[PDB]
Design goal:
By secondary structure, the chain is mostly helical. About 75% of the residues lie in helices and about 0% in strands. The chain has 10 helices and no strands. Helix 4 packs antiparallel against helix 8, helix 7 packs antiparallel against helix 10 and helix 8 packs parallel to helix 10. The longest helix is centred in the middle third of the chain and has 30 residues. The N and C termini lie far apart (about 40 Å). The structure holds biliverdine IX alpha. Biliverdine IX alpha binds next to helix 1, helix 2, helix 3 and helix 8. It catalyses: heme b + 3 reduced [NADPH--hemoprotein reductase] + 3 O2 = biliverdin IXalpha + CO + Fe(2+) + 3 oxidized [NADPH--hemoprotein reductase] + 3 H2O + H(+). Pfam families: Heme_oxygenase. Keywords: Heme, Iron, Metal-binding, Oxidoreductase.
Length: about 210
């Protein structure tokens, strides 16, 4: 549409984004109703899906698609594992954690995108996760420190070590989106995938809200 991909993504995903953002689990977490335990469960599930997402990013980058956008400085899985070591006090969690049903679907989609090397689909998922982390991530980190006394060294996920000027980086991210060479089919595919990405994330929160 008329104002470029970054604008079309934001508008197209608005309804799914709002649903995800206002899940009961995330709402209770950010208001201080839960605890470090619940934050840890979230980060455990996020480690599972970021691990899958980053295999898909690596596959797509290697194909030569969206290279400048798929900045490896964004990788969260390793930082996340370090956070989880601190949150759980040992590496015990690696052999304990299991994917919730929501995370199974989400990982399965990311693995399909990986093995298909589906560039447009991968960009959609990259946008929903990383640009969200860059944008609202400092708010989440601040609330985890404020409400629950989480040590900032256990919030490495939100820090983005290697990025100095965060506002400039987000602006340049949106310009890289606008600059991607996409057919109508590819652009439509990307947009639909971005909505599905928000849908997966909402179900992840729903399953966390339950005993799952
Ligand atoms: C499934 C949950 C969830 C995801 C995946 C998410 C992603 C997400 N959050 C964004 C921005 C943002 N997101 C937030 C806030 C939050 N972000 C949060 O995850 C939480 C819990 C808050 C607290 C309200 C803020 C303040 C922005 C700023 C805006 C912007 O740059 O457009 C963007 C940027 C949009 C854009 O500029 O196009 C994305 C993709 N937001 C979500 O809520």
């Amino acid at each position: 549409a008329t104002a470029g991909l970054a604008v079309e993504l934001k508008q197209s995903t608005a309804q799914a984004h709002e649903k995800a953002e206002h899940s009961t689990f995330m709402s209770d977490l950010l208001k201080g109703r839960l605890g470090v335990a619940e934050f840890t469960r979230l980060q455990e599930q996020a480690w599972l899906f970021y691990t899958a997402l980053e295999q898909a990013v690596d596959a797509v980058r290697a194909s030569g698609f969206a290279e400048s956008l798929l900045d490896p400085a964004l990788n969260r899985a390793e930082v996340l594992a370090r956070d989880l070591d601190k949150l759980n006090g040992s590496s015990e969690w690696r052999s304990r954690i299991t994917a919730s049903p929501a995370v199974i679907d989400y990982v399965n989609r990311l693995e399909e995108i990986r093995d298909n090397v589906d560039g447009p689909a991968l960009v959609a998922h990259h946008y929903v996760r990383y640009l969200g982390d860059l944008s609202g991530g400092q708010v989440i980190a601040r609330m985890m420190q404020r409400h629950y006394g989480v040590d900032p060294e256990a919030l490495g996920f939100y820090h983005f070590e290697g990025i100095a000027k965060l506002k400039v980086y987000k602006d340049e991210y949106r310009e890289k989106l606008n600059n991607l060479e996409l057919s109508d089919e590819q652009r439509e595919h990307l947009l639909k995938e971005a909505t599905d990405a928000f849908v997966f994330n909402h179900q992840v929160f729903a399953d966390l809200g339950k005993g799952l």
